Amino acid sequence: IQRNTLNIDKLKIETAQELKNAEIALRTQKTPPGLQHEYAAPADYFRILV
Amino acid sequence: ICQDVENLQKFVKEQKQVQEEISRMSSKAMLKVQEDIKALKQLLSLAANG
Numbered sequence: 001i002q003r004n005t006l007n008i009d010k011l012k013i014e015t016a017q018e019l020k021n022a023e024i025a026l027r028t029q030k031t032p033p034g035l036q037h038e039y040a041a042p043a044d045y046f047r048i049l050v
Numbered sequence: 051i052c053q054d055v056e057n058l059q060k061f062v063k064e065q066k067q068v069q070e071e072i073s074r075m076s077s078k079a080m081l082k083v084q085e086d087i088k089a090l091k092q093l094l095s096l097a098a099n100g
Contacts, residue, residue: 031070033070034066034067034069034070034073035070035073035074036070036073
């Protein structure tokens with residue numbers, strides 16, 4: 001069970017970053033839609049994955 | 051209640067449209083002006099010195 005605790009803390013942590021790079025993504029482009037701009041993210045996060 | 055969210059998000063979003071609308075509307079026309087009056091003032095100095 002014990003072991004099973006670290007596993008969720010990992011799935012926790014992760015759905016949280018992905019909820020979100022998913023959130024830097026919708027609604028950013030949601031704006032766009034109306035007319036605004038969100039983006040040099042990526043450049044952030046893209047170079048971050050690099 | 052869920053008639054309900056159909057409308058409120060709708061009136062809210064209707065409003066974001068106007069927000070976009072203003073966003074669409076933005077200045078260069080304005081920036082132009084100071085340059086010109088700064089310029090016309092100078093020609094006037096010419097004519098005066100002439």
